[model samples]
Target: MKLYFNGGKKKKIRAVDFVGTIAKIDGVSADDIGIITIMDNASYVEILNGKGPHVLKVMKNTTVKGKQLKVNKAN
Candidate 1:
């Protein structure tokens, strides 16, 4: 896991959808994303270690299903 998102990969935003959003905003393909749990209120996203920091920087304006993603480098 490289980063944390303030939203869950639940029904309103399915796993595939959120992964696509995260990947899209980071300029990567959906093949490299997300290690989400289906029932969590918040969750972490997995991407290549090299892409993590750069993606984190650019996701400040990214949102899915009209909710802005609040991401932080996962500790």
Candidate 2:
């Protein structure tokens, strides 16, 4: 499952930021996350094993380096 994250390059967001933040969620880990494509203003994170819903729920209220991000399911 692909999850889209807003505020990437423009916000100086990086792969590590997503990885570090999402990895802290219960039942989620670096290994559970797949390819992370970072763009100029957004990013696409692949969540494995049908864990997208869980991550999405937690990420809605999570932040990276004190910056709140908009996360949603991707195509």
Clashes of each: 0, 0
Q: By TM-score, how accurate is candidate 1?
A: 0.71
Task: Give the Å shift of residue 50 in candidate 2.
Answer: 0.9
Clashing pairs in 1: none
| Candidate 1 wrongly placed segments (more than 4 Å) | 9-11
**Any runs in candidate 2 off by more than 4 Å, and if so which?**
none
> Which pairs of residues clash in candidate 2, taking residues 3 or more apart in a chain or in different chains?
none
lDDT of 2 at 27: 86
Q: Write the per-residue lDDT of candidate 2 for residues 1-75, one digit (tens) a residue.
A: 898888678789888988898888768878999999999988999999888898888888776867988889985
lDDT of each: 0.67, 0.86
RMSD of each: 2.6, 1.0
